[PDB]
Structure formats: structure tokens, C-alpha cells
Design a protein around this ligand. Structure first.
Ligand SMILES: CC[C@H]1/C=C/C=C/C[C@@H](C)[C@H](O)[C@@](C)(O)C(=O)[C@@H](C)[C@H](O)[C@@H](C)C(=O)[C@@H](C)[C@H](O)[C@@H](C)/C=C/C(=O)O[C@@H]2[C@H](C)[C@H](CC1)O[C@]1(CC[C@H](C)[C@H](C[C@@H](C)O)O1)[C@H]2C
Ligand SMILES: CC[C@H]1/C=C/C=C/C[C@@H](C)[C@H](O)[C@@](C)(O)C(=O)[C@@H](C)[C@H](O)[C@@H](C)C(=O)[C@@H](C)[C@H](O)[C@@H](C)/C=C/C(=O)O[C@@H]2[C@H](C)[C@H](CC1)O[C@]1(CC[C@H](C)[C@H](C[C@@H](C)O)O1)[C@H]2C
Ligand SMILES: CC[C@H]1/C=C/C=C/C[C@@H](C)[C@H](O)[C@@](C)(O)C(=O)[C@@H](C)[C@H](O)[C@@H](C)C(=O)[C@@H](C)[C@H](O)[C@@H](C)/C=C/C(=O)O[C@@H]2[C@H](C)[C@H](CC1)O[C@]1(CC[C@H](C)[C@H](C[C@@H](C)O)O1)[C@H]2C
Ligand SMILES: CC[C@H]1/C=C/C=C/C[C@@H](C)[C@H](O)[C@@](C)(O)C(=O)[C@@H](C)[C@H](O)[C@@H](C)C(=O)[C@@H](C)[C@H](O)[C@@H](C)/C=C/C(=O)O[C@@H]2[C@H](C)[C@H](CC1)O[C@]1(CC[C@H](C)[C@H](C[C@@H](C)O)O1)[C@H]2C
Ligand SMILES: CC[C@H]1/C=C/C=C/C[C@@H](C)[C@H](O)[C@@](C)(O)C(=O)[C@@H](C)[C@H](O)[C@@H](C)C(=O)[C@@H](C)[C@H](O)[C@@H](C)/C=C/C(=O)O[C@@H]2[C@H](C)[C@H](CC1)O[C@]1(CC[C@H](C)[C@H](C[C@@H](C)O)O1)[C@H]2C
Ligand SMILES: CC[C@H]1/C=C/C=C/C[C@@H](C)[C@H](O)[C@@](C)(O)C(=O)[C@@H](C)[C@H](O)[C@@H](C)C(=O)[C@@H](C)[C@H](O)[C@@H](C)/C=C/C(=O)O[C@@H]2[C@H](C)[C@H](CC1)O[C@]1(CC[C@H](C)[C@H](C[C@@H](C)O)O1)[C@H]2C
Lengths: 75, 75, 75, 74, 75, 75, 74, 75, 75, 75
């Protein structure tokens, strides 16, 4: 049971690597929001909800990674 | 038995790394949606369904990773 | 047998990493479809089949990764 | 117990890798802000809060990594 | 020979990582095809064979990865 | 306690990987500063403080990585 | 001897990772060819040999990886 | 002591990975300098100092990686 | 001396990872050659030698990786 | 002694990974040089020295990696 515990803790740390995807992705979505509004200010109210949706869906991939991390840590 | 359980848990952690691809990919699709709408607002109803399609197909790759993760954790 | 089984499960997890390629690639294809359509709406029926071909070929690289994962998991 | 402790320390190191996402992502948001403002200075006051929101959400992904790190360390 | 069989299985999993290159590359080619056709529809018949060639060559890098994987699994 | 000291040292090495994010990110910010100033020299005094802020925030992610590294080395 | 053999097989797998560079790089060259030809069709005959040279040199880096793989396997 | 020494040397090698960040980042800065100068030669004396600042800050992230490497090698 | 031999062979394989840098980099240089000539055909004789120099310098990083690989394999 | 030598050799292999950053970075600089000259041939003598500077500074990061590699291999 020492080796299995050890494996849970190493696995937990490994499971956070994938959060780099949401880190970069969320930024990509907001960068597009900024560039799109700068080029066409009147489009703000249209694309802002699209940026929020894009953020949420990219963020979810990070949520799945952290869930596994917490399952290994505590579950 | 200790060695096998340990391996399953390390394996489950490793299995989440691939989710970074969907994290970035989902964002790439939404960035294109936002930049496309900003450049040509009249195209919104045409490209929005393409963004949903793209997100879903990109998300599927992350779901396959999570499937293996859960099979290792629980199966 | 314990060490061999352990290696199968670690290998199965490692085998999912490559799916990040399709996660990003599927999105790159759909981003191009969206931007091409935004710039030239009249071309949509011509490029849509190209995007479907492109995403399918990109996805298949990840499915081969998953194939090896399942062979390791269940073989 | 020494094997478990060893693993916590290895795991704590591994858990910082994901911070590279925030490092890059924060910069992506600021690059868009700078280029957007350069192209259309009048839009600055509109896009700056969008930049604040974007970098904060990108940064938080890294804070989640660090939280697992600190859990393993302490 | 627990050790050698274990190594074949871990090696086979690792051998699939490289497939991410074809996943992204195939997409890059098709993205260019889509963007090139949208900007200049008359060029379609010229660039489409170029995109098939690009796909095949990128794909070949993933084929080699899978070849080593199967040699480790079955060879 | 060969094992625990060894783990602190391997962990400390691994903890520096994340610094690559600030390496790339800091550069991305300064690239935008340079391109923005070249395209619109009159905007320099506006965007320069933005680039300093961007650098600091990206840099902070590398600081956290180094903090964990030093905690593992000396803490 | 079993430990050495094990290592050769692990090493052979590791040696294919670098092929991802060629996978991406071959595609980068073809993307430029397609976009260059789309923008200026008259240039096709000039840039096509440049594309052949570029992808071949990119591809060779992957062949070097595979050579080490095969050395370890056989 | 053998295992601790072994871990120092493996750690020292791992500690160099992060230098890839500065390798790419230094180049991103200089690419921006070149393109900004090509588009607006008159701006060169203004942006050159920015590129030097940018590259130095990017490089330093890699130098911290190298610092940890040497501490592990020679400490 | 079994463990040291084993380490040489694993190290040799690890030392080829860095060749992915030249793979992507060489392509980047040739992509620029192609795009630059397409946009300005008269510049071909000027930029072609620059692409050859760029190729060689990027290629050298791959040479250093393969040298270490061959030193571990045979030296 | 076996364990320490083994570690040095694995370490030396790991130490070359960072060279990928210079491999990509050197190429990014030369691509900018080529695109800059193509857009504005008269700027060649100004930007060529900037490309040499950028390449050398990016290459230095790869040299630091190789330094650690050789110290492990031979020192
Ligand atoms: C996958 C679904 C995601 C939901 C998206 C919802 C989008 C709708 C949209 C309108 C949001 O509500 C939002 C833009 O207003 C929003 O994010 C706010 C709630 C949020 O307060 C935002 C405006 C901020 O100011 C924010 C930067 C906060 O200051 C910061 C402390 C929080 C960062 C953060 O990442 O929080 C997460 C995030 C919201 C995520 C987002 C989850 O949720 C939290 C709580 C639940 C779990 C723990 C997740 C885990 C994480 C790894 O995904 O973290 C939650 C802890
Ligand atoms: C190809 C499969 C994917 C399906 C895509 C379908 C696209 C159609 C499109 C119309 C969607 O339904 C959508 C845009 O309306 C949509 O995502 C809604 C369901 C959703 O309510 C949306 C509007 C949101 O508000 C959404 C951002 C939520 O706030 C947020 C909490 C959900 C994030 C998320 O990633 O959800 C996933 C996703 C839908 C994924 C979707 C998977 O499903 C969930 C629930 C089921 C299981 C648990 C999956 C596992 C995952 C790893 O694939 O996760 C599920 C957990
Ligand atoms: C390096 C050689 C590559 C060949 C390229 C040939 C290009 C010519 C071009 C005209 C093709 O024939 C094509 C575009 O028409 C084509 O690919 C068709 C065969 C294909 O049917 C296409 C129209 C599709 O619709 C396709 C998306 C299929 O629906 C889908 C089920 C197949 C995806 C796929 O990746 O298949 C691969 C691929 C063709 C690859 C292609 C390999 O082949 C398969 C079978 C052989 C091995 C197992 C490879 C492994 C892969 C990882 O390289 O996978 C083969 C299994
Ligand atoms: C998260 C907070 C960051 C602070 C940002 C502050 C921004 C304000 C801005 C006006 C700065 O002060 C600055 C641009 O003037 C500036 O950085 C100067 C201090 C600096 O002297 C600058 C002009 C330089 O010329 C600089 C390139 C130096 O010549 C060079 C030797 C230092 C590089 C470097 O990375 O230093 C770091 C950095 C400032 C970082 C910056 C950290 O600080 C140092 C010391 C503290 C720790 C050890 C960090 C670790 C690093 C990995 O984050 O490294 C510190 C060691
Ligand atoms: C770091 C210095 C690099 C030198 C660059 C020189 C540039 C000058 C320029 C005029 C060249 O000579 C060139 C463009 O004409 C050129 O590369 C030719 C020699 C080359 O034949 C080219 C035109 C091809 O047709 C080429 C695609 C061949 O068909 C292909 C079989 C060779 C691929 C290859 O990567 O070869 C390498 C390369 C030249 C590399 C290039 C080495 O050299 C070889 C032989 C020496 C060692 C073994 C290297 C190791 C490699 C990992 O760097 O591989 C050598 C084995
Ligand atoms: C900041 C340090 C870097 C120095 C940059 C200097 C730039 C100035 C600029 C004018 C150069 O000298 C140069 C462009 O003229 C140049 O590279 C020449 C020396 C070179 O002859 C050039 C014209 C070439 O033809 C060159 C492409 C050769 O064909 C090719 C065989 C060399 C590739 C190469 O990477 O060389 C390196 C590099 C110069 C590196 C340069 C390192 O040096 C070599 C020899 C010395 C040691 C062994 C280093 C180790 C490396 C890991 O840093 O490798 C050396 C092995």
C-alpha cells in the first residue's frame, strides 16, 4: 500500500499538465475578442457572448484534468 | 497486485495529458468564429454552426483520453 | 506477470498523449473553414467537403493512438 | 513512508509544468491588447477590461496547478 | 523476461506520441487548401493535388511511428 | 532517506520546465510592443506600460516555478 | 542481458517522438506552397522545387530519429 | 549517497529543458524587430532598445533553469 | 555494467527528441522562402542564399543532438 | 558507481532536448529576415545583422544545454 499511495501522488501531479491547454486556449479566445473588437467596435455585443462560450468549453478540458487530479489525491 | 494498482493510477494521470489538445483546439475554433464575425457580421448564422461542429469534434479527442483515464481509475 | 500487466496500463496511458495532435488539428481545419467562408461566403459548398476530409484524416492519427491504447488495455 | 514522501516531492515538481500554459496565455492576451490598441487607439478603454478578464482566467489555470503542488508539498 | 515484455509494451505506447505530428501537419495542409481556395477559387484544381501530396508526406511520419509500435507489440 | 533526498533533487529539476512558458510569453509581449510601435509610432507611450505589465504577469508564472524548485532544493 | 534488451526497446520507442517535427514541418512547407501559389499562380514552377527541397530536408530529421530507432531494435 | 548523486545528475539534465523557452522567445523578439524595421525603417532606433530589453528578460528565464542545473551538478 | 549499458541505450533514444526542432525549423525557413518569392519574384536570388544559411544553422542544432546520440550508442 | 554512471548518461540525453528551442528559434529569425527583405529589399543591409544577432543569441541557449550534456558525458 506504500507504492500505491506513492503512485496516487505522482499521478495527481501528472494530471495537472493538461491544464496548460486551457491556459493557452482561454488566452487565444480572449485575444480574438480583443482583436475583433479593435477592428470592428460595433460587433462587441455580438462576439462577447461567443468569447464567454469559447472560454467555458476550453476551460472544461482543464476541469476534467483537475477532477482526475483530485480523484487521485482524495478519492 | 500493488504494482498493478500503482500502474493504473500513474496511467490514469498520464491519460489526461492529451486533453491539452482539445483545450487549445476548442479555443482555435472560437477565435476563428470571433475574427470571422468581426470581419463579416452578416456571416454569423453560417459560421456559428461550423464553430459548434469544430468544437465538438475537437472535444471528442479529449473525451477519448478521459475514457482511458476512467477505465484505468475504475475499470 | 505483475510487471507486464503494470507496463500495459502505463503504456495504455502514454498511448493517449498523441490524441492532442488531432485535438489541435481538427480545430485548425475548422478555423480555416470559418475564416475562408467569412472572407468569401460563395465558396462554402466547395470548401466544406475539404474540411470534412481534412478533419477525418487528422482525427484518424489520434484514433490509431487510441487503437494501441485499447490493445494494451484489453489485449 | 519514505516512498510516499519521495512521491509527494516528485509530484510537486511535476505539478508546476502546467504553469507554462499561463505564462504563454497571459502573454497572448497582452499581445492582442497591444496590437489592438496600436491599430485603433480609441478602442483602448473598451478592450482593456477584456484583457484583464482574459489574463485572469488564463492565470487561474496555473494557480490550479500550484494548488496541487502546495497540497503535495505541505 | 517480465522485464523485456514490459519494455515492449511501454515502448509501444511511447511510439505513438509522434503521431501528434501528422495530426497537426495534415490539418495545416488542409487549412492552407481551404484558405487558398477561398481567396482564389480558380486555383482549386492546381492546389488540391498539392494538398493530397502534403497530406501523404506528413501522414508517412505517423506511419513510421505506428510501424515501430507494431514491431514492439507483435514483432 | 536516500529516496527522499533523491526525490527533492529530481523534483527541483522538473520544477524548472515551466519556466519555458515565461521565456516564450515575455517574448510574445515584447514582439507585440515592437510591431505595435513600428505600425503606429505615436502609440509608444500608451503601449509601453502595457508591455511592462504583460511581462511582469508572464514572469510571475516563472517565479512560482522557481519558488517550488528552491523549496525542494533548500526548503 | 534482459535489462539491456529492455532498454533497447524503450529507447526505440522514445526515438520515434522526434518524427513529430517532420510531420509538422513537411506540412508547414506545403502550406506555404499552397498559399504562395493561390496568391500568385504564375510563381508555381519557381517555388515547387523550393518546396521539394524544404520538405526533403525537414523529413530527413525524422529519418535520423528512425535510424536510431532501427539501430536499437535490430 | 549513490542514489542521491544519481538523482542530482538526472535532475541537472531535466533542468535544461526549460531553456527551449528562451531559445524560441529570443527569436520571437528578433523576428518582430526585423519585421517592424522592414515595414518602417525610420523606427529602428526606437525599437532596437526594446528588442534588447525583451531578449534579455526572455533569456534570463533560461538562465534560472541553468542556475538550478549547475546547483544540482556542482552543489 | 548492465545498468550502464541500459542507460546508454535509453539516453541515445532520448537524445533524438531535440531533432524535432530542426524538423519544424527547417520547414519554417523554407516556408518563408516560398512566401517571400511568391510575393516578390524578383527577390529570389537575394533570399535563396539566406534560406540556405537559415537551414544550415537550424540543422546544426539537430546535428548536436545526433552527435550525443551516437556518442551514447557507440562512444 | 553503476547507478551514478547510468544517471550521467540518461542525464546527458535529457540535456539535449532543450536544443529544439534554438532549432525552432534560429528558423523564426531567418523567416523574418526573408519576409522582411521580400517586402522591402532596400532594408537588407539593416536587417541582416539583426538576423545574425538573433540567431547567435538563440543558438546560445542550445549551447548551454550542450554544455551540461558534455559535462555529464565527460566531466
Ligand atoms: C467548465 C465550466 C466553466 C464555466 C464557465 C462559465 C462561463 C459563464 C461565464 C458568464 C462565467 O460565469 C464568468 C466569465 O462570469 C466567470 O468566469 C466568473 C464566474 C468569474 O468570477 C470571472 C468573471 C472572474 O472574475 C474570475 C477571473 C475570478 O476573479 C477568479 C478568482 C476565478 C478564476 C477561475 O478560473 O474560476 C473558476 C472558473 C470560473 C471555472 C469555470 C467553469 O469554474 C470554477 C468553479 C468550478 C470548478 C472548481 C472549476 C475548475 C476549473 C479547473 O475549471 O473552477 C472557478 C473556480
Ligand atoms: C462530441 C461530444 C461532445 C458533444 C458536443 C455537443 C455539441 C453540441 C452543442 C449544441 C452543445 O450541446 C452546447 C454548446 O450547447 C453545449 O455545450 C451545452 C451542452 C452547454 O450547456 C453549453 C451551452 C454550456 O453552457 C457549457 C459551456 C456549460 O456552461 C459547461 C458547464 C459545460 C462545459 C462542457 O465542457 O460540457 C461538456 C460538453 C458539452 C461535452 C460535449 C461532448 O459533454 C459533457 C457531458 C457528457 C460527458 C460527461 C462529456 C465527457 C467529455 C470528456 O466529452 O462531457 C459536458 C461536461
Ligand atoms: C503514407 C501513405 C498515406 C497515403 C496517402 C495517400 C493519398 C492519396 C489520396 C488520393 C487518398 O487515397 C485519399 C485522400 O483518397 C484517401 O485517403 C482515401 C483512401 C480515404 O478513403 C478518404 C477519402 C477518406 O474518406 C478517409 C477520411 C476515410 O474515410 C477514413 C476512414 C480513413 C482515415 C485514414 O486515416 O485512413 C488511413 C490513411 C488513408 C493512410 C494514408 C497513408 O493509410 C491508412 C492505411 C495504411 C496505414 C495503416 C496508415 C497508417 C497511418 C497512421 O499512416 O493508414 C488508412 C487507414
Ligand atoms: C513577478 C515580478 C517580476 C517583476 C516585474 C517588474 C516590472 C517592472 C519593470 C519596470 C522592471 O523593473 C524593469 C523592466 O525595469 C526591469 O526588469 C529591471 C529591474 C531590469 O533591471 C531591466 C531594465 C534589465 O535590464 C534586465 C534585463 C537586467 O539587465 C537583467 C540582468 C535581469 C533579468 C531578469 O530577468 O531579472 C529578473 C526580473 C526583473 C524579475 C521580474 C519579476 O525579478 C527577478 C528578481 C526576483 C526573482 C528571483 C525573479 C525570478 C524570475 C524567474 O521571475 O527574477 C530578476 C532577477
Ligand atoms: C550543420 C551543417 C549542415 C550543413 C548545411 C550546409 C548547407 C549548404 C547547402 C549548400 C547544402 O550543401 C545543400 C542545401 O546543398 C544540401 O543540403 C545538399 C548537400 C543536399 O544533398 C540536399 C540538396 C538534398 O538534396 C538533400 C535533401 C538530400 O537528398 C538528402 C538525402 C539529405 C538530407 C540530409 O539531411 O542530409 C544531411 C544534411 C545535408 C546535413 C547538413 C549539415 O549534413 C549531413 C551530413 C553530415 C552530418 C551526418 C549531418 C547530421 C545532421 C543531423 O545535421 O547530416 C547530411 C546527411
Ligand atoms: C553565441 C555563440 C554562437 C556564435 C555565433 C556567431 C555568429 C556570428 C556569425 C558571423 C557566424 O560566425 C557565421 C554566421 O558566420 C557562422 O555561423 C559561421 C561560423 C559559419 O561558417 C557559417 C557561415 C556557416 O557556413 C555555417 C552554416 C556552417 O556551414 C555550419 C557547418 C556550421 C553550423 C553551426 O551551427 O556552426 C556552429 C555555430 C557557428 C556556433 C556559434 C555559436 O559555433 C560552433 C563552433 C564552436 C562551438 C563548438 C559551438 C557550440 C554550439 C553548441 O554553441 O558551435 C559551430 C559548430
Amino acid at each position: 500500500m506504500q507504492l500505491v499511495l506513492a503512485a496516487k501522488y505522482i499521478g495527481a501531479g501528472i494530471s495537472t499538465i493538461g491544464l496548460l491547454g486551457a491556459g493557452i486556449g482561454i488566452a487565444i479566445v480572449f485575444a480574438a475578442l480583443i482583436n475583433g473588437v479593435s477592428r470592428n467596435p460595433s460587433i462587441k455585443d455580438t462576439v462577447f457572448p461567443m468569447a464567454i462560450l469559447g472560454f467555458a468549453l476550453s476551460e472544461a478540458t482543464g476541469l476534467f484534468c483537475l477532477m482526475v487530479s483530485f480523484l487521485l489525491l482524495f478519492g
